[PDB]
Design an enzyme around this catalytic site. Structure first.
Site, PDB file in Angstrom:
ATOM      1  N   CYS A  42       0.727  -1.119  -0.024  1.00  0.00           N
ATOM      2  CA  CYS A  42       0.019   0.153   0.025  1.00  0.00           C
ATOM      3  C   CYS A  42       1.043   1.227   0.057  1.00  0.00           C
ATOM      4  O   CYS A  42       0.361   2.282  -0.402  1.00  0.00           O
ATOM      5  CB  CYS A  42      -0.853   0.018   1.213  1.00  0.00           C
ATOM      6  SG  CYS A  42      -2.272  -1.174   1.272  1.00  0.00           S
ATOM      7  N   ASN A 267     -11.024 -27.183  -1.381  1.00  0.00           N
ATOM      8  CA  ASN A 267     -11.468 -28.416  -1.508  1.00  0.00           C
ATOM      9  C   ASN A 267     -10.845 -29.638  -1.063  1.00  0.00           C
ATOM     10  O   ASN A 267     -11.088 -30.924  -0.810  1.00  0.00           O
ATOM     11  CB  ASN A 267     -12.342 -28.863  -3.025  1.00  0.00           C
ATOM     12  CG  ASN A 267     -11.001 -28.629  -4.053  1.00  0.00           C
ATOM     13  OD1 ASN A 267     -10.458 -27.714  -4.045  1.00  0.00           O
ATOM     14  ND2 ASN A 267     -11.113 -29.842  -4.723  1.00  0.00           N
ATOM     15  N   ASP A 276      -6.146 -12.091  -2.007  1.00  0.00           N
ATOM     16  CA  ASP A 276      -6.620 -11.761  -3.258  1.00  0.00           C
ATOM     17  C   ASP A 276      -6.938 -12.910  -4.067  1.00  0.00           C
ATOM     18  O   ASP A 276      -7.799 -13.058  -4.819  1.00  0.00           O
ATOM     19  CB  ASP A 276      -5.577 -10.932  -4.222  1.00  0.00           C
ATOM     20  CG  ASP A 276      -5.115  -9.671  -3.398  1.00  0.00           C
ATOM     21  OD1 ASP A 276      -5.681  -9.295  -2.553  1.00  0.00           O
ATOM     22  OD2 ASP A 276      -4.431  -8.956  -4.016  1.00  0.00           O
TER      23      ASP A 276
END
Ligand code: CA8
Ligand code: CA8
Ligand code: FAD
Ligand code: FAD
Ligand code: CL
Ligand code: CL
Ligand code: CL
Ligand code: CL
Ligand code: CL
Ligand code: CL
Ligand code: CL
Ligand code: MG
Ligand code: MG
Ligand code: MG
Lengths: 437, 437
Positions: A42, A267, A276
């Site tokens: 950032c 899974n 993300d």
């Protein structure tokens, strides 16, 4: 357990650190394909703008230091190129030696994030911004070539922050975007101040504009214009870093992201995904959600650490999608479903524009607050605020309200902290409730 | 119904206006004992400080405009001197003619608020601050006497605001207070920046100090000290304007306030009470509450309007006591039970001190946030924040949390709006949650 982590930044380094708080015995190894771990993603535009000049703000750790403090092994310039889930190993390419090896795991945590898209031109003056490698290259290119005119492509928060910082650095940026839909996490009709701020400072922009051709510094555009630029920074979206996952048994959606449950499990047993790359659901409505921002990476990292080494009753309750960007004097913030998701509900909208605080008191600026609600149950669906002042405050309050399933009508009951420098006896949030009657 | 309102300011004018929104037919008359209706109580210190120089800012209506715009009759310099509740009339003294008369009502709304206490010295240099008349007199006295040294008595928020304003106007105030509990809505240890800011500006203060005697401009103190002052502003608390109520059937508590239900009804039918005169209970705990501030005056006003002319299922849910004051560079905000009320609970305290925003981002400052929770149920009882930046935001968020009786642990789940100018990926609020175990 033996813990392997892929990606050593927002999700990965954080998760590994949180596990180490809880579990001092487990072996933990992180692979990172690029040079640096734990960089402040950032902060990067602000490094370019010379707002941040101390390296220590751009980079929290080196692998040597991470090991010394946390007994976590981090291998940079090591790219994971396959996940051999049936054997419980990952295949890793040591980029320095160009040799690959297998690393075994008991638990695997995927936080590979996303890469910046490129327009694909063959150009030595064009750059993307995603890591500290990028940032250093940009800073170096600026000095080596005495850059003045910069072309900034795209109009999301990354490009916008880059533009602002290039200007404050003393350069002369121009902004182009392929359409008129800038800053698209914000309601399209609430973005005018972006253009007003460019105008006020005489920063050129062209919408519905694109790069057509490049010849050294001569740039030919779709509009037919031809101009000379010293450098180009393209901020044209990102794509998930998931190619290396495709051969595995891990389920990916058609866009290359990894659906996870509320424990950030994929899974496949013993494999988690966060940051993300992961997709989940909204907290306040029954819809899928992806919110590729820092809060989500850190929160998931904490939940995964609890799952592995702590209290495994701790689970995610979904995203709200709270987001914010500064552009020159203005703040643009929103929370809830995206504009394009509103159509899945029968909704109504209420809005107020009012001084952030006392008109009399110095330094007022109108703050525009907009709230969308579900007609079926009066629950708040989305909020957005733009103004020079007070926007982050109202959006955080509304975030907390949406967490507790508040109705729009209950906003009349919000007890605001009032004195002339801060708000009003009936705040904008309160006025939203009254106007929804 | 014919509506009579007593008091034409925060509760009274607002309530009348809100009734008119819903009801165009009813006759509404407001009686106000002093000169001005709808003055901006909150603005008065800033008028003295000349931070507000346009009086339109400090006066929001005249009776002539209220009638033209809202068709509501306001009679200033008319003091209500008795409530004849059995015949549903009030006795009113016309202060200009000194003649009294009865005004009949179907509904009576009492918003007479509170008056400033006085130390009771005979002195032409001493002033209190409660309305625009007071503000004019103070401003006039400063000019007529070229006031430089001013003694500010009392260390509540209003008095602190007056002090700051006298100082920025160019005068030289000294602060005293009869105890060391300055700014008492805030935790005592968290008030230290008030004294720091005084010290930084060489503004003298003495706590546990009182006036012993006044002889012209020569002031003798409890400490034994004798000083010369050009003016004295006493902020030594307030008392409820309920003397005119004592002969009626309306029930008053031992301090002269009016207990009301969640409809702001008094014990006597068709009579409501709102604003500083009324007492209720907290929203989040089972305790009585008195919160004599603007938000409560405005909220009760709306609720009474709905009771009388709108939706009578709309009821008050109690106070949280959210409050805030600015003093020079610092903000001091709190919400929930008062410090002295914590002893009614088994509680624990959690706190963080962290940058208001990204440490690398310019103009940062440490923000201290403290949260108290009930050990029996993890619910948040009180929160407090102090710092140059970000305190109002966190306390507003926590007010919204408490409204929903959120637990301290659920604060980890708060989804903040993060970018470097505004917060952290794990905000101070989230950190309270992570630290609470
Ligand atoms: C933009 C994009 C976001 N990007 C990133 O965050 C990428 C870079 N970040 C990291 O790699 C990672 O977050 C680091 C920097 C390694 C921090 O790891 P962690 O969060 O586990 O914290 P740390 O171990 O550094 O901790 C020390 C302080 O944290 C307190 N703490 C942490 N966790 C807990 C829990 N669970 N419970 C209680 N306390 C906890 C520790 O007590 C400790 O404190 P102390 O008291 O001695 O200080 C934005 S950005 O620019 O990258 C950005 C990133 C991070 C912060 C701001 C901005
Ligand atoms: C200091 C302590 C508290 N003091 C005061 O409030 C001083 C006295 N206040 C009053 O007398 C009263 O509040 C006045 C100032 C007369 C205002 O009354 P009201 O709240 O009813 O608002 P108004 O009729 O002026 O309405 C204007 C904007 O709000 C909209 N509105 C109001 N109510 C509703 C409802 N229920 N539903 C929908 N909309 C509502 C209006 O339509 C109007 O909108 P627009 O044309 O602007 O769109 C505090 S202070 O310093 O005195 C202070 C007081 C007030 C504000 C700030 C500071
Ligand atoms: C310029 C910029 C500004 C931003 N500003 C904000 C902001 O203001 N607010 C906000 O909330 N968010 C902001 N973000 C977004 C925030 O940085 C991301 O949401 C966050 O970094 C996501 O964390 P992550 O771990 O999923 O991805 P990253 O932090 O990007 O980490 C992923 C890492 O994985 C590595 N990797 C990928 N594949 C492999 C592999 N095969 N093997 C080994 N390593 C691999 C990558 O090299 C990368 O280092 C910004 C991002 C950028 C780029
Ligand atoms: C200097 C100052 C600064 C303040 N700052 C803040 C702040 O920053 N934040 C905040 O939340 N609050 C603040 N307040 C408090 C806020 O003003 C009060 O909470 C609010 O005014 C209460 O409204 P009320 O209607 O009960 O009393 P008021 O607004 O004071 O109105 C009561 C009115 O009734 C009249 N009256 C009394 N008796 C009679 C009678 N017998 N007949 C006819 N009229 C009568 C009085 O003359 C007065 O005009 C401040 C107050 C002051 C004085
Ligand atoms: Cl290399
Ligand atoms: Cl090896
Ligand atoms: Cl400059
Ligand atoms: Cl009636
Ligand atoms: Cl008179
Ligand atoms: Cl008459
Ligand atoms: Cl500081
Ligand atoms: Mg530099
Ligand atoms: Mg003047
Ligand atoms: Mg009688």
């Amino acid at each position: 357990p033996k813990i392997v982590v892929v990606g050593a930044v927002a999700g990965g380094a954080t998760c590994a650190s949180q596990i180490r708080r809880l579990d001092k015995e487990s072996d933990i190894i992180i692979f990172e394909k690029d040079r640096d771990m734990s960089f402040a993603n950032c902060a990067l535009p602000y490094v370019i703008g010379e707002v941040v000049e101390d390296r220590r703000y751009a980079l929290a750790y080196t692998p040597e230091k991470f090991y010394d403090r946390k007994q976590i092994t981090v291998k940079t310039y090591h790219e994971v190129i396959a996940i051999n889930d049936e054997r419980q190993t990952v295949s890793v390419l040591n980029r320095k030696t160009n040799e690959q090896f297998e690393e075994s795991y008991d638990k695997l945590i995927l936080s590979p994030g996303a890469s910046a898209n490129s327009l694909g031109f063959e150009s030595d003056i064009t750059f993307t911004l995603r890591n500290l490698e990028d940032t250093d290259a940009i800073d170096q290119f600026i000095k080596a070539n005495q850059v003045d005119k910069v072309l900034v492509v795209g109009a999301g928060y990354v490009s916008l922050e880059v533009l602002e910082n290039l200007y404050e650095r003393g350069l002369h940026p121009t902004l182009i975007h392929r359409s008129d839909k800038i800053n698209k996490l914000m309601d399209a009709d609430m973005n005018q101040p972006i253009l007003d701020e460019l105008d006020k400072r005489e920063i050129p922009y062209r919408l519905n504009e694109e790069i057509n051709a490049i010849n050294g510094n001569e740039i030919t555009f779709k509009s037919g214009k031809v101009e000379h630029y010293d450098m180009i920074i393209e901020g044209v979206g990102t794509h998930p870093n998931s190619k290396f996952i495709e051969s595995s048994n891990i389920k990916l959606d058609r866009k290359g992201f990894i659906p996870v449950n509320d424990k950030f499990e994929t899974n496949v047993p013993n494999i988690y995904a966060i940051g993300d790359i992961a997709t989940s659901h909204y907290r306040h409505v029954d819809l899928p959600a992806s919110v590729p921002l820092a809060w989500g990476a850190h929160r998931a990292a904490s939940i995964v650490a609890e799952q592995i080494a702590g209290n495994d009753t701790i689970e995610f309750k979904g995203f709200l999608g709270n987001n914010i960007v500064k552009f020159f004097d203005y703040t643009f913030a929103s929370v809830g479903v995206k504009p394009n998701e509103l159509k899945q509900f029968d909704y109504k909208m209420v809005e107020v524009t009012q001084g952030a605080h006392a008109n009399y008191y110095p330094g007022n600026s109108p703050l525009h607050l907009r709230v969308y609600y579900d007609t079926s149950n009066r629950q708040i669906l989305r909020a957005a605020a733009v103004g020079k002042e007070g926007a982050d405050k109202r959006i955080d309050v509304l975030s907390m309200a949406m967490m507790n399933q508040l109705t729009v009508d209950e906003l009349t009951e919000f007890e605001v902290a009032y004195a002339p420098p801060y708000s009003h006896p009936k705040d904008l949030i309160n006025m939203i409730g009254y106007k929804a009657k």
